[model samples]
Target chain A: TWRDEIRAIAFDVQGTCVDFYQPILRAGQTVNAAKGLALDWAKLSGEWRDLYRVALDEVIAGKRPWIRVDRIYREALDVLLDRHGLSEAFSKDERDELNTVWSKLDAWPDSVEGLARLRSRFVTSTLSNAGMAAVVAVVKHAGLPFDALLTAELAHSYKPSPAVYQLAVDYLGYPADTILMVACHKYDLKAARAFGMRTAFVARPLEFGPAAKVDVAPESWFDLHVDNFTQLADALVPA
Target chain B: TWRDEIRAIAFDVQGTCVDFYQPILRAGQTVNAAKGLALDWAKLSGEWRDLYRVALDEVIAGKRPWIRVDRIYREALDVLLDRHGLSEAFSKDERDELNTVWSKLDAWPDSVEGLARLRSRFVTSTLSNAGMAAVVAVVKHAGLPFDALLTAELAHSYKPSPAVYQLAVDYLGYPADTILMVACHKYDLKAARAFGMRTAFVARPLEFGPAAKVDVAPESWFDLHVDNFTQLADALVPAL
Candidate 1:
């Protein structure tokens, strides 16, 4: 009955629908080889991401004004790159293009097809902390089907903030309970549930990397939990 | 060279992409027969539109504060209906649905296909006077392809006003000259041109109906003047 009543299905872009590490690894290693140093890319990617998390907290604390994720990415990148021994690895153009890897990252193998299958029945959209323009680029790069581009920009707030989860449902013109937020991040789904929206946890074991300690467990707290978009679509929409 | 460099293609929704007359005629006639009055649906449709235009003029002139187009439609619908001999012909639900017909107007046969063709090369979107939510409804209803849904509501101003045209280009993050505002109305194109944005005029000869003296003549002032979306798409993004 719960599945039967769902109207809109939204997803987070980074690490959930698409793999961020491959592009980060590619970009970081490209610079690594150019710099001619044994820079630990895994450490760089993880720390750069942690820098983003830390920056968002600073944003919430009012130490930083509302800034774009692209800006945050670039800021985190500079901080992380300097921590390694390669400060002048990439030229301005190369650094700018590499920062955009977040926009051009490839999706998980099942993302497009599974989203397509799910979209045939339910209204599908993107609910990402990624900037609106970045999310658009990612969707185009991955060839994903999205009926709407629901963004943190629309709410002027990021994920884990109550505004992002609630304002998206308001714009979707649906009851908060009728829309399901699907993501690989436990905190995102948990926040959605607390905001009175349904949640679906998807497992992306290699989101951080092959051996990174990411949240891949299918929790009972979520309305539905599945290993991938295909299983999520199957359980939710039942072709 | 200007045409060579356009990045985003935006269109006016009402009267340009879709025809609103047919549904208004259908719904009006339904109430006409039910009420036993020989109501002229054409007159009703035309004047209702005129009232909306007049009301918008007032809004721009500071007589009426800027409000949603849905509200404008309702205000004009009420004024027009009360003018005729049949004010109580339709129930409240029927009246509400009649107002909503604006958001679900039937697209011209060439709109979807031609827009799809042009969209292959550029970021296509709607630059509508309708509310953002209404435009979204219309797009989903017709299965039209738009990269974004730009609206008067988004800009807090309606078309023919310089603010709507200029602010839309501002949000699109494009140089004003690089984004073309395409529409069927001469006044809209003229305003866009004055606003320093490129403009395209698409002809819909039967838009107001037969015997209507609407502008159909091609003019040099507009960047591109085509008889329909197909020719515009052909000129802009020719088939390979």
Candidate 2:
């Protein structure tokens, strides 16, 4: 019943739609190894995610200044490497090169197919905290058909902020009711719902990859909950 | 004296370095002709320029909502055409196409050479009111080598605003003192000067062609006054 009401869907890129953590963690390991420090994937991945959240929070709260994702990642890398005693390993130039690896992330196996299936029935686009260039590169690399690539760059704020949510709706030239936000994170869904847009929770059980002790579940406000993007497509726009 | 202190230079595109008025005026004439109305270039160009000033004033005054330059131009075109009795002749799609002619404007002969010369001694870029897409297309079209391409799109405000001036400096990661705002208009120099950036006045005597009325001259606050880019280059750069 709710499926017919959704005309367009905005996807969360990082964990839900694409598997961004592995490539990003591997790039961090490679950079660490090149600097003569052994990286513990578990420790490094946690630190990376922590810094990612901290940086986004700083930007969202207006404590740290606004910058592109590429720039923010570079700053995060500097701190993470310093913590591991590999501070001297990367020069400014090398650090920039390593941070650019975000642009080369690989998509999940079902990402392309699921997106294509959903795109046929509804307008599809990214609603990621990633910079425009990062999202643009991922969209082109993954061959994901998107009507437009929306990001926090335009609003100078991250997701969950009213500015970011309104920016996507404003650019789409549509009312909030017609747009549906498809994300794995409950926080993102909660925000979307608060802003009057429809919400779908796509469970990415392996988002933290097996060690994910945190449970992924639907928030009370989410309009639909599904197992995967394929199931989501089937339920939201079934043939 | 101020030229020696300049490490970067930004230019205004339309009417300053490029002949955007002729193509836009001609497009208006065509739309009017299609509507069986006799076209007057003077009145049409005046109305077109007035709309730009009005929209720019709103951004400067912070009275109206801000939007991309392309959207501003399209909105202004709607009002201009409706006034000329050519509203029926042009569809929204046709008007949108006509608005894109801003991208196809011909640069003044000295524009490239001056910009090239300035580029050698300074980090040259655009600080125009044009949208990003339009400016990028023209920069690529003309094969101009620039360190950056900036527009009001990034700042959401037009030139003469502190935000526009600050956006260029912020993007360049340079101090305002090292940057110079170059334009043919005295008011542009005034704005840049107020923002603590150096200013250059490049006089385009024929900017308005025969419809010209006001004298275009450098005010006392202007840091440099030059007749052409070649002359400006000669004064700024060393003989090689």
Candidate 3:
């Protein structure tokens, strides 16, 4: 029923559209190796991601002030690298380059086809904390046709800050009710629901790998809960 | 002398770092050709640039409301394309792509090396009216190193407005005087000076391609006036 009202669909790019684990892990290892520090690449990658979720959680829960994902990632990487005695190993150039590897992430296999299909019926774009560079990189990398790439960088706040959701509708030039926020994170969905937008929960059970035990189920507030983007497409355009 | 106080160097990417005129003219011509109309591509490009300067002048003089460069360009393009009897040929997709061609602009030969060298000594960045995507594309395409990329998209106002200059300093986490605003435009320098930022005028004598009369001489407000980025670097690093 909520699908009937949806005019646009916005996706969360990172863990939802693509598995950022492997590439991020590889990039972490490359940076650590350059520093002559033999870090457990997988563990370090997990920690980096954990820090991201924790930072987002703090911002969502109103415990900490909202900041750009770029700033958050840089601060976390600095602390993590410093802890491993690799503080002086990286020059400013290397540090900046290494921190921006998120802009080069690969998309999921289903990303292009599913998004293309959805685009045929609805206005499809990204709504994420990632900067326009990161989102544009992912869209170009996946060959996904996005109506526009929306980001917190444009809004000056991270989700689930009210400004983030508000900016999406504002930039899309659409009413909140006509926009559907699609993501794998319930907290993001909760924020969208709070903003009076339609919501879709695409279960990304492996978002945090096996350690992720949180609820992947749709809350009563969500309009649609599906296993993947294809299911979301099916739900939106039934035969 | 002002280079000694510079912690960050903000750039205007469009005409300063990358060439935006050729590709935009080509796009408009392509649309016009599709309709078998003989559109004067050069005139259209000149008019678009002229309208942009006029809009900036209005914003600077506080005579009209501030508008983003992209919005202003789109409005001008719409009118120009309509005048060429190709209004229907410019669909939403074509218009969007035409506007976005600015993002894919090629950098001037010296842009990458000069900016990279400047970034080593200073926190080099951009204070352009281009959208975030356009700036990012140009930066990545040119491999220009920047500490941050500030745009009017953040301030919802275009350059020549104090809001634009203030927003750059606010985002860079630096004092206004500690940042040096680099541009080929006097209006941009004037705005930067008004916001307490040091200004560097890098003369782009051919930016408008023979029609360029403004920004040729140093305004008294400019901290440094150089013929090129290499000269700017040379002045900044005299020991080199």
Candidate 4:
């Protein structure tokens, strides 16, 4: 198999291995219920994500100073609350706890077992854009079994950046061709492919909520395209 | 207890959690038996370690350019072979394999289980002077259960350096006071204590070998002193 050369797999965590939307939505609901308010949490959470990603892009483009993903999310959350005329609803402690929803996400049903199977065969690590502490917390919180945590924060950059992809090769001690970069987002795979790595596109249709159209289509550039991690494990390490 | 504040534990891997002396000595004996030579392998291995440590100190002091511990060991190995008049005995490939002995060292008996126990309660990591790949290989080879691989390479320096200790606080997201630095060597703990971190000294009397005289004494500055990882676990996470 062509995949036989891969010595390690680096996963993009936010949408690939774990589901953050529903959990963030529920956390928003908790805040609304506690404050006796009727905020459309799903919309608020979506806006929060959009703002957070834009902040990352600004940082990557050198338009903004380097800030951790955690702080970026916090800043976005504050903006979201103020725009919705609910800035006063949350105290500093409450807003801090709400921002931590990113670090304590729920993993997909197949993530834990599939990661275990892959880890049993190859060295599995998270190559996320989240800060080291955030990724570590997410791995432990979601029970994701990974060999190591390699994050873009180590390089002081974000994904789609060459430095971020180079971390897997440098720290995992594997050649670019021997590491398979797994992610649900095409931008991540495109950047990794540009960096001379094998790429796996794990389709996460409901990643942005089921109603939203996400591109989970098979691309010729992808070495392997699977709908979920279980199928991914089957293709890479069949029983 | 004063130890109640510890949220994470950073361990020194070489002699503290794993046994490198015997494995390296055994590897040396294998080479000796293969060549039908009566080289004093134990002494040669100790000298290799001494040279490696001195190189690390020199690098720390800016007397030498920064080099990864793996390369330092490989350089030390070539010197050991030359000093013993056995430089021509092994091929370059064989010498490279010997250099990897540092990565595949044997773990102490209590390390696997005790680490699992400690990891269940706190975020346990390797604050090793070894390169990231070397520490990762060691943890996988020895079946050590650690939550993360935090090494000095991340900071581009060696331990006892403040930048190396700052990696733990920065990456682990814990205050220095809440992180416990565990090691068999006082130099490691002394530096950790000076950096405002809690310290645990786990004694390994035979780390250098049975004939060596190691200081296993309890120290006043140490937050907890124990004989092994199990004892350290007992003092931290007692069985119900």
Specify the highest-lDDT model's number: 4
What's the count of clashing pairs in each model shown? 0, 0, 0, 0
* Model 4 spans with C-alpha error above 4 angstroms: none
DockQ-based CAPRI category assigned to the predicted complex of candidate 2:
incorrect
lDDT (C-alpha) at residue B199 in model 3: 82
Number of backbone clashes in candidate 1? 0
lDDT of 1 by residue, B82-167 (tens): 88745677566767877887777778888999988987788777887887667766777777777766677655777777778765
lDDT of 2 by residue, B1-240 (tens): 655677678887776678766776777687667767677766776787689778878877889888776677778889998987778877888888877776677777877887777766676677787766567556545555455566666677777778888866765546889888888888778888999998888888777666677566547887888887788778887558
Displacement of residue A127 (Cα, Å) in model 3 is: 9.7
Q: Which lDDT value does model 4 have at B102?
A: 84
lDDT (0-100) at residue B143 of candidate 3? 61
Winner on lDDT (1 vs 4): 4
lDDT per model vs. reference = 0.80, 0.74, 0.74, 0.88
- Candidate 2 residue B177 C-alpha distance from true site, Å: 23
Interface RMSD of each: 2.7, 7.8, 8.2, 0.8
Candidate 1 clashing pairs? Answer: none
Stretches of model 1 off by over 4 angstroms after superposition:
A29-39, B29-38, B62-66, B160-173, B194-196
For residues B57-148, what per-residue lDDT tens digits would candidate 4 score against the true structure?
A: 88989998888889999988888889877789878999998887888889999999999999899998889888888888888888898878
By DockQ, rank the candidates, best first. Answer: 4, 1, 3, 2
Give candidates' CA RMSD values in order.
2.9, 9.2, 9.5, 1.3
Instruction: State the lDDT at A201 in candidate 4.
Output: 94
Say which prediction, candidate 1 or candidate 3, comes out ahead on DockQ: 1
